[PDB]
Amino acid sequence: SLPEGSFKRVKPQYDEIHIPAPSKPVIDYELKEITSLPDWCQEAFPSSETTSLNPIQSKVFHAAFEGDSNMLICAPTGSGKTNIALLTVLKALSHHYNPKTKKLNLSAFKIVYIAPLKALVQEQVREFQRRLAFLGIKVAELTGDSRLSRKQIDETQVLVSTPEKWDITTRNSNNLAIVELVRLLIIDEIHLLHDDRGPVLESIVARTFWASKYGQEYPRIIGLSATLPNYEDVGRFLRVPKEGLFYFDSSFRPCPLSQQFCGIKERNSLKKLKAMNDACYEKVLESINEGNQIIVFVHSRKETSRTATWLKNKFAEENITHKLTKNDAGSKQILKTEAANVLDPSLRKLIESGIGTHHAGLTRSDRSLSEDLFADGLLQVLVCTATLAWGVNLPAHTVIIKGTDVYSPEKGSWEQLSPQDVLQMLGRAGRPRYDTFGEGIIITDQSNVQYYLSVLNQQLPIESQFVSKLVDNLNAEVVAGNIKCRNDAVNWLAYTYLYVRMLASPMLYKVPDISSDGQLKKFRESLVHSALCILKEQELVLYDAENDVIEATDLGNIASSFYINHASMDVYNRELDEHTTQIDLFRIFSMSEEFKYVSVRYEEKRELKQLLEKAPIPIREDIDDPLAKVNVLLQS
Amino acid sequence: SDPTITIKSYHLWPSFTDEQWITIESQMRDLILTEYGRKYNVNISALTQ
Amino acid sequence: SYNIEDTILTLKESSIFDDTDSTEVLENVKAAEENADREKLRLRQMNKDRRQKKKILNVSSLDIEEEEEGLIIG
RNA sequence: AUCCUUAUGCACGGGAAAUACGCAUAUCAGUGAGGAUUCGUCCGAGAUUGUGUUUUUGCUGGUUUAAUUAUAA
């Protein structure tokens, strides 16, 4: 703690603590060069700028060729991960691909790359194409908007999928040949397990080990993640051999992250918000004089525009010219070409000032435009929601996170910024390629700073949320037919990620059994009981308490196929009726649980009002209710 | 919760120390703030002092 | 003797002289403040929505009138 | 070394008032201001003049909704 805070500044509005940049790594190792590779692998790095691998990569690489084993990398994800995955891919290709005969063996190996987001999948795919073009490989996307069919999967070799669509592809019974063919299963951002999509990954993992026992040849599993505690427990979840585990701290990061907080001493929201804006302004003023390109995160998208307006009138009151003093002719040109043409959320004026913003709710084209302009650097300041850290790789020298309380429809309450989101926001930083270090900043209330220091140290385990997704996963598995009884269910649950975590800390995750049942037999079986009661109530699976026999129903099969959540499922069950009509169909569709996170907005409200007058299919609900918004959007 | 904390024949409420009350009062405030919202569909966090 | 509903029921508030000879009701303590806080809450969120979003209500005669609208042996 | 008296400074705690507190390149005033008396005497520091503010001085508090993505084709 004491080494972390070096220096603290006290200011009238706020008390700011300035953490120094992390230490540079000790060298016990050799930087591994490219000429050490075999013949075909030397084009793995077609542009070899250093001709030597980064501090993280070399050791993990030679270990990766040396062993064929399940591996885990907890790393800054400083662009180091992309190349490592590429290299393991090339190894599998060489194992199925002869060194002498240069014909690539296409039908032997199959590869899967699990990237949480569609956009990041896209980016990855272009990377894999660039690096793998010399072998003559088809690298194509299996997920979502990708829209690959029954055939192209067979044709392709390397796959880049999102977790959801990969889950649904491997869940289906007919394709199992492809699943067996895949030798190489790469999991990017295994730290996702903390978040509620992570349940899908652990379910996929469980299916890989447990579900294919009739062919029974286990594929190579490579986890790739941001640095996280309880790495050992992660390995015990997967298989991981002790040597495959590589834990690298932030000292191995390309640009050391200078951590900074401002505690806010104010309480009432009207002065508190003003104090935050003042602090942000002060930071921006310190940054831009150094020629620093800056990002300011916020909670909500509506917050972005008003924040940028505040920076325009305030920042401009201070000095107008300095933001663009250079190439003002070309800045006027490019700015008018971009802003004036495609933008229509009254965001053009912000672009024109040269403080822009990016958020969900900005047009897809406008969105790409803002990214590009901020890359060129006519945009000095970029106000953003949480989309960028999660999605896009583009780093920016200074990163400010404004505020604590985010509203989550999960609770229906304002919670604190969750650590897993904070960390990935801090990830985008001073550019590893160009700049030397980053500036992280967190605009926050002082009382919660004590919390953010620790959670920002990344001492927090990847929390297992399997409790919510357990039921649906179990149903899908019964549909596969792999579980005929409670004992089978708990054996599958032994390879489940919550199992490990329970073993580590039973009372944290509410194991009553504790001393009893070291293997948590009765705890596992009790969860299965709990699941199969509600499933049976939803007529998803057949179950009997004392006799214990399991079988899958038609509704359960449907939920498995289209990956409907169990809540959505029972909603359909009751709300659909014999006499239900066209009006009620849209209402039920709206009621689908996947829209629970949807809510009506005040900038949306005028267009909603115009719609619902002329809407052909009537709405029983009203403008204030999100369901009505959903089904009118459906009509549109 | 704690049977070791004994209501005498004299008193109504059980005898605690101060800090035990300090926690209990928070636990009691929790029921109020959760059920007011839960009944009225109102989020706890957004409430002003 | 008129009821509204291991539960206990208490007398609802009524004026002496305005009540005079009239039917008296028995309601639950939590149910009375329950209903009152549901209705008045519905009025509060509509207050914040009206004043914030600056919308003008249709209301008038029938709506305000309908807003004016708002046995056991022992 | 303990204990005590007086005056002054700082201060925790407890009251009362703000028709009350002050200011003066200004006139006097223990070298006698202003009063009192039982008619012998007795008390002993302000009085005039101008002015500032005075239902009030400073400072505060309350009230007037993140991202993301899943079908069998």
Swiss-Prot record, chain A:
Binding-site residues for ATP, renumbered to this chain: 75-82
Compartment annotation: Nucleus
Domain Helicase ATP-binding, chain residue ranges per copy: 62-246
Residues of the Helicase C-terminal domain: 272-475
Effect of residue 412 to R: Reduces spliceosomal pre-mRNA splicing
Position of sequence motif DEIH box: 188-191
Domain text: Contains two helicase domains. The N-terminal helicase domain has catalytic activity by itself, contrary to the C-terminal helicase domain that may have a regulatory role and enhance the activity of the first helicase domain.
Known role: RNA helicase that plays an essential role in pre-mRNA splicing as component of the U5 snRNP and U4/U6-U5 tri-snRNP complexes. Involved in spliceosome assembly, activation and disassembly. Mediates changes in the dynamic network of RNA-RNA interactions in the spliceosome. Catalyzes the ATP-dependent unwinding of U4/U6 RNA duplices, an essential step in the assembly of a catalytically active spliceosome.
Note: Present with 1440 molecules/cell in log phase SD medium.
The protein's assembly and partners: Component of the U4/U6-U5 tri-snRNP complex composed of the U4, U6 and U5 snRNAs and at least PRP3, PRP4, PRP6, PRP8, PRP18, PRP31, PRP38, SNU13, SNU23, SNU66, SNU114, SPP381, SMB1, SMD1, SMD2, SMD3, SMX2, SMX3, LSM2, LSM3, LSM4, LSM5, LSM6, LSM7, LSM8, BRR2 and DIB1. Interaction with PRP8 is important for recruitment to the U4/U6-U5 tri-snRNP complex.
Family, similarity comment: Belongs to the helicase family. SKI2 subfamily.
Protein name according to UniProt: Pre-mRNA-splicing helicase BRR2
Organism: Saccharomyces cerevisiae (strain ATCC 204508 / S288c)
Lineage of origin: Eukaryota, Fungi, Dikarya, Ascomycota, Saccharomycotina
Name of the coding gene: BRR2
Residues of the whole record sequence present: 447 to 1082 of 2163
Curated annotation (Swiss-Prot), chain B:
Subcellular location: Nucleus
Domain of life assignment: Eukaryota
Subunit structure: Component of the U4/U6-U5 tri-snRNP complex composed of the U4, U6 and U5 snRNAs and at least PRP3, PRP4, PRP6, PRP8, PRP18, PRP31, PRP38, SNU13, SNU23, SNU66, SNU114, SPP381, SMB1, SMD1, SMD2, SMD3, SMX2, SMX3, LSM2, LSM3, LSM4, LSM5, LSM6, LSM7, LSM8, BRR2 and DIB1.
Domain comment in the entry: The MPN (JAB/Mov34) domain has structural similarity with deubiquitinating enzymes, but lacks the residues that would bind the catalytic metal ion.
Its biological purpose: Functions as a scaffold that mediates the ordered assembly of spliceosomal proteins and snRNAs. Required for association of BRR2 with the spliceosomal U5 snRNP, and the subsequent assembly of the U4/U6-U5 tri-snRNP complex. Functions as a scaffold that positions spliceosomal U2, U5 and U6 snRNAs at splice sites on pre-mRNA substrates, so that splicing can occur. Interacts with both the 5' and the 3' splice site, as well as the branch region. Has a role in branch site-3' splice site selection. Associates with the branch site-3' splice 3'-exon region. Also has a role in cell cycle.
Additional free-text comment from the UniProt record: Present with 468 molecules/cell in log phase SD medium.
Official protein name in the record: Pre-mRNA-splicing factor 8
Annotated organism of origin: Saccharomyces cerevisiae (strain ATCC 204508 / S288c) (Baker's yeast)
Full-protein interval shown: 2028 to 2076 of 2413
Swiss-Prot record, chain C:
Record localization: Nucleus
Source taxon at top rank: Eukaryota
Residue ranges the record marks as coiled coil: none
Similarity annotation: Belongs to the SNU66/SART1 family.
Function: Component of the U4/U6.U5 tri-snRNP particle, one of the building blocks of the spliceosome. Required for pre-mRNA splicing.
Assembly with partners or alone: Component of the U4/U6-U5 tri-snRNP complex composed of the U4, U6 and U5 snRNAs and at least PRP3, PRP4, PRP6, PRP8, PRP18, PRP31, PRP38, SNU13, SNU23, SNU66, SNU114, SPP381, SMB1, SMD1, SMD2, SMD3, SMX2, SMX3, LSM2, LSM3, LSM4, LSM5, LSM6, LSM7, LSM8, BRR2 and DIB1. Interacts with the pre-mRNA-splicing helicase BRR2 and the ubiquitin-like modifier HUB1.
Protein name in the entry: 66 kDa U4/U6.U5 small nuclear ribonucleoprotein component
Complete-protein stretch covered: 148 to 236 of 587
